[PDB]
Amino acid sequence: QEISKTLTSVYRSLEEKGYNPINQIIGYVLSGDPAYIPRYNDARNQIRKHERDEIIEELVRYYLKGNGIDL
Amino acid sequence: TVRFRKQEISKTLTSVYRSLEEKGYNPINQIIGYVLSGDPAYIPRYNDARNQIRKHERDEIIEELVRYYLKGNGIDL
């Protein structure tokens, strides 16, 4: 559950800083550029615990399970 | 034809997974490779899987994956 906790915390810190949190997270996943995630409230340091391919693996597994795949 | 439960991405990614599974490949690994690279060559032609992935851009796939995850986990809610 680490990745869901990270993305939750990052979304809420993005929101508090007045960013569009979805756009910034999409930007991070596209680019791997930590600059899309503010340093505020440790958000950038939290997302850097994971590798982008681990984040993508979780997004993909979650999406497929929710759309009817038995993993 | 309706799917009983964006919907095109749902159709594409589930169909790609099942075709990769039928051909004995690691489907998650191949899908991750596509998402990181945008390269349709990570997807076999088999059962129209590559044709379906090529209906989308990598950023549209990533946008849907991110939006679906946040909404489903109650973060964007």
Author numbering:
A (entry chain A): 18 to 88
B (entry chain B): 7 to 11, 17 to 88
What does the publication say?
Here, we identify a protein (CcpS) that is phosphorylated by Stk1 and modulates the activity of phosphatase CpsB in Streptococcus suis, thus linking Stk1 to CPS synthesis. The crystal structure of CcpS shows an intrinsically disordered region at its N-terminus, including two threonine residues that are phosphorylated by Stk1. The activity of phosphatase CpsB is inhibited when bound to non-phosphorylated CcpS. Thus, CcpS modulates the activity of phosphatase CpsB thereby altering CpsD phosphorylation, which in turn modulates the expression of the Wzx-Wzy pathway and thus CPS production.
To gain insights into the architecture and mechanism of CcpS modulates the activity of CpsB, we first solved its structure to 1.6 Å resolution. CcpS also formed a homodimer, each monomer containing four α-helices. Helices were connected by a short loop and a single turn of 310 helix between helices α2 and α3. However, we could not observe the electron density map owing to the highly increased flexibility at the N-terminus of CcpS. Interestingly, two phosphorylation residues Thr4 and Thr7 are included in intrinsically disordered regions (IDRs) of CcpS. Interface residues analysis of CcpS homo-dimer suggested that many amino acids residues were involved in the formation of a dimer. And the amino acids region I73-L81 among helices α4 was contributed to the hydrophobic core, which was similar to the previously reported structures of CcpS homologs. Importantly, we found that the disruption of CcpS homo-dimer structure directly resulted in its dysfunction in regulating the activity of CpsB and thus CPS production. Superimposition of CcpS onto CcpS-T4ET7E folded structure revealed that overall structure was highly similar to each other; however, we can observe that a resolvable structure of N-terminal partial region is significantly different between CcpS and its variant CcpS-T4ET7E (chain A, N-ter).
